[PDB]
Design a protein around this ligand. Sequence first.
Ligand code: NA
Length: 156
Amino acid sequence: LPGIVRLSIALRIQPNDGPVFFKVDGNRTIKLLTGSSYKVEVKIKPTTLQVENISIGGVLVPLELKCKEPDGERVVYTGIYDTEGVAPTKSGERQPIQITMPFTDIGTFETVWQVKFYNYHKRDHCQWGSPFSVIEYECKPNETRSLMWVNKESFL
Ligand code: NA
């Protein structure tokens, strides 16, 4: 419908392009591996939208426009998310990490994931649970509640 942005985010662990899983804590915790890397696949509509990248916990993931969604109506952007240098989660089974994705001249998508970062050599602790193919978001750049960018303030 007019003014609805739909975006899905998928992660596939390298080198096998395998699935990513969540666990329930208290409430969905995404299980991610440190010292590793992920294919990131972003599917957007409308197809007139332009994304340049996605940032995950402060890590920049440059996105490249790839093609039209096989068997679908979105456009597909992919990049590689590098988790080399990310600290494993030390306590409390999860931690919040910031997701940020700018759409040029439309607005910015932000959300918080709950994540457990696993030590590289505990990949067998990480790669199991409930696999999810994507996280699907419905976004409204002109919702009443969408915070407008304040470009300037002037006392007159
Ligand atoms: Na807006």
